[PDB]
Design an enzyme around this catalytic site. Structure first.
Site, short mmCIF file in Angstrom:
data_model
loop_
_atom_site.label_atom_id
_atom_site.label_comp_id
_atom_site.label_asym_id
_atom_site.label_seq_id
_atom_site.Cartn_x
_atom_site.Cartn_y
_atom_site.Cartn_z
N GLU A 66 0.82 -1.21 0.00
CA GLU A 66 0.00 0.00 0.00
C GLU A 66 0.86 1.27 0.00
OE1 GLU A 66 -3.01 -0.01 3.07
OE2 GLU A 66 -4.12 1.66 2.19
N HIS A 101 -9.73 -0.21 -2.58
CA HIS A 101 -10.71 0.28 -1.60
C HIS A 101 -10.97 1.78 -1.79
CE1 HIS A 101 -6.72 0.61 0.16
NE2 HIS A 101 -7.16 1.42 1.10
FE LIG Z 1 -4.67 -0.37 4.48
FE LIG Z 2 -5.95 2.36 2.90
#
Ligand SMILES: [Fe+3]
Ligand SMILES: [Fe+3]
Ligand SMILES: [Fe+3]
Ligand SMILES: [Fe+3]
Lengths: 381, 381
Positions: free
Chosen positions: B131, B221
């Site tokens: 990420e 997300h």
């Molecule tokens: Fe995360």
């Molecule tokens: Fe995140």
């Protein structure tokens, strides 16, 4: 010649597996790991003792390619240690790309079975080792990820002390052999199935490691102390402890380790060191560990990777039996890797706890209370 | 209920594959990645939205587990960047150990085929993503080694600018979208078969990446901008460019992204965002991207990983067809991963040049002359 045809037949029957070659570091030096459009140069190099044409010519069966990076030289000791980890990933990256771009010559191997299947196909079995625990930046987690990237041995030191062990060439001593962390790392190396390499480590560090290890170890490139006294060569005491350990001493072509005057070193000296070890601790505990490309010039008759047939013919000429020559070529190092896997599977099967890194707390007590309160709210639903 | 039995049948027919879960970071927070003797707690956690019992209960088919580490906070910018790389290897290490210690529940997957075979066996297909490109410490070599460790997507940023792209939540902008290095990295990501993730990146960075990428991308997300205005949600312009790209927007359960007042966020809001996207760019470009354990509290009806059957039942209740619900559950994200592999195999088959790191010279001209002189001496023999 009948002895040369005998040597050629042996090289086809079983793989000659060399313990250490720094060709990946030469690629960093010359190309800066940019091999795009460099096939012509990779087959016929303008520098060094290794290229793809001469590698075919010498009939080598397998190779542990070194992912060596230098000892950290930064005044900021945190930066230098972390820098070595990033450089290690660069060297593992170029090794994998080198293998993938030349699949007719090189094929990746990480086990006894993958070595043999590579050898059946006519490829040089391409394994990986790292040369110093300075390369993991104090992270046992990083070590396990290097194993997952294909690393199958770890030299405990290069020419610098680290948190785990003492190098041979640096005085004074830091730990006096292995550290407290080093002793604990030996258990983890045996558990994960990482082959221990004792080249470059101090005499005392070797003695302690050879008693403590539950799996057989190697010297990937070291020679005999009694024939030539050096900090990098193996004493009669440690040769005896290598026998009990069931390990293998892979004899080195470094001129400084074979003779007091480097320019006098020869093929014959390498054969003398193999025969010394084989006679005293058995030919099932001796191997070949060139250290090609970890040196500018090689001995007379072992100038580059094309010269392996002369070494095999030379051993036969001194009266070493075919079976014993086959052992020295590669069967012994295959057995050690096989046993390192079997010990790891046994310890992993028994469910031994792995060594974990000491991490900082990321949450304070206020955050932990919020998380527990949140969990119990969810339990009420 | 017939709608609940329908949802249960769908969850057995095809895998629900969630886009993002930070359970590995909770393990770093709570256990400091020491899971030895913690099975009881791993099955029934005292904190967080994920554990192994509730993971079974919710009937989840697969999961991209996040190997997230925080943005570098060190005043020495070299140390912080390199520190993130070491922490990344720690997080990948604990993810692999978590999977290996619980093989009845979790099974590693790195492809469309490995997802299906895991699902046939009744395991949660366990994939990995990182990420933020701050995690690679400016090393494309490190990126390729993360791919070899099992990483199958890379979020271009977290909540910090890096050398490659702009984060959404940080102002002012650094590059104004993607950098010059970022544009070049997109080609390399497509070539190596790494799925691009555009969650956390700026609106302009998304637009540029969606035009430039030769493979379909994801939002692992993120939610819809038109329903709730936020820097982290996807605009109608970028949804349209996602359609041309053939990518998937995996709808987020973050309360702040679903409603102006976080405490008003619900299951219904998540279903509204899925239906908005499916109606406007087709249900073959929408997915589920919980971000469980990237938040303290979830929406009403989606409090933890046990709540997936309620989401599937809810979608059916709004009149979304079985085939379209199956697509949203997991078929779409499988297709993207499948296409990312096919584009990579095509580019690797054509022999496209890989991106290389800019390295320092390790040898001066004196050393290079010695090496060339040595090579020619060997040619004379
Ligand atoms: Fe995360
Ligand atoms: Fe995140
Ligand atoms: Fe070396
Ligand atoms: Fe060496």
């Amino acid at each position: 010649s009948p002895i040369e045809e005998q040597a050629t037949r042996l090289l086809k029957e079983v793989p000659l597996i060399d313990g250490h070659n720094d060709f990946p570091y030469m690629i960093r030096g010359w190309f800066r790991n940019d091999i795009n459009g460099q096939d012509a140069h990779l087959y016929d190099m303008p520098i060094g003792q290794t290229d793809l044409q001469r590698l075919q010519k010498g009939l080598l069966g397998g190779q542990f390619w070194s992912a060596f990076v230098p000892c950290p030289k930064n005044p900021d000791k945190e930066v230098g240690s972390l820098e070595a980890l990033r450089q290690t990933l660069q060297q593992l990256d170029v090794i994998h790309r080198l293998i993938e771009r030349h699949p007719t010559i090189l094929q990746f191997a990480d086990s006894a079975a993958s070595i043999w299947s590579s050898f059946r196909a006519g490829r040089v079995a391409s394994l990986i080792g790292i040369e110093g625990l300075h390369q993991i930046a104090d992270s046992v987690s990083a070590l396990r990820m290097l194993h997952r990237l294909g690393v199958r041995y770890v030299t405990l030191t290069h020419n610098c002390h680290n948190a785990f062990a003492d190098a041979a060439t640096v005085s004074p001593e830091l730990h006096g052999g292995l550290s407290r962390k080093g002793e604990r790392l030996i258990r983890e190396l045996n558990r994960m199935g990482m082959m221990i390499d004792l080249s470059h480590t101090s005499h005392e560090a070797q003695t302690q490691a050879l008693r403590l290890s539950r799996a057989p170890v190697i010297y990937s490139h070291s020679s005999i102390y009694s024939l030539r006294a050096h900090a990098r060569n193996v004493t009669d005491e440690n040769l005896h402890l290598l026998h009990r350990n069931r390990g293998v001493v892979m004899i080195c072509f470094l001129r400084e380790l074979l003779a007091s005057e480097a320019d006098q070193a020869t093929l014959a000296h390498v054969i003398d060191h193999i025969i010394y070890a084989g006679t005293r601790i058995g030919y099932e505990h001796v191997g070949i560990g060139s250290d090609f490309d970890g040196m500018l010039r090689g001995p007379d008759g072992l100038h580059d990777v094309s010269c392996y047939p002369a070494l095999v013919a030379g051993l036969l000429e001194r009266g070493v039996s075919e079976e014993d020559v086959k052992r020295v070529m590669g069967l012994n190092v295959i057995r050690v890797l096989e046993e390192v896997e079997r010990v790891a599977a046994e310890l992993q099967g028994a469910g031994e706890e792995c060594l974990c890194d000491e991490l900082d707390e990321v949450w304070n007590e206020d955050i932990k209370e919020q998380l527990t309160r949140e969990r119990e709210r969810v339990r009420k639903l």
